[PDB]
Amino acid sequence: KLQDSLDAGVGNLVDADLAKESAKLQSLQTKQQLGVQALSIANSSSSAILSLF
Amino acid sequence: NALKSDFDSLRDQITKAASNAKFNGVSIANGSTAKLTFLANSDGSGFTVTAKTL
């Protein structure tokens, strides 16, 4: 019983809550995709200069 | 004499089970300290667990 209790204690200390991890995962992937689109829009900014000439 | 030896053996088992009950070097039940105070809020106020000597 002592070994079981010490194992459960270390398990409370180190273990991750997988459900919150999956939620963070979906939010982070969507954030990354929108960030890539923002970087593309930022790269496109220089194009306006050419039409001046 | 047999019953007395049985009684002493059970007593020694109590001392062993009580002294061995630790987690991470501290114990709420071996009587080694008056109380144990855990964090309770971001301000630093502490939750208080008064010790109980088994």
From TrEMBL, chain B:
<comment type="subunit">
    <text>In C.crescentus, the flagellar filament is composed of multiple flagellins of 29 kDa; 27 kDa and 25 kDa.</text>
</comment>
<protein>
    <recommendedName>
        <fullName>Flagellin</fullName>
    </recommendedName>
</protein>
<comment type="similarity">
    <text>Belongs to the bacterial flagellin family.</text>
</comment>
<comment type="function">
    <text>Flagellin is the subunit protein which polymerizes to form the filaments of bacterial flagella.</text>
</comment>
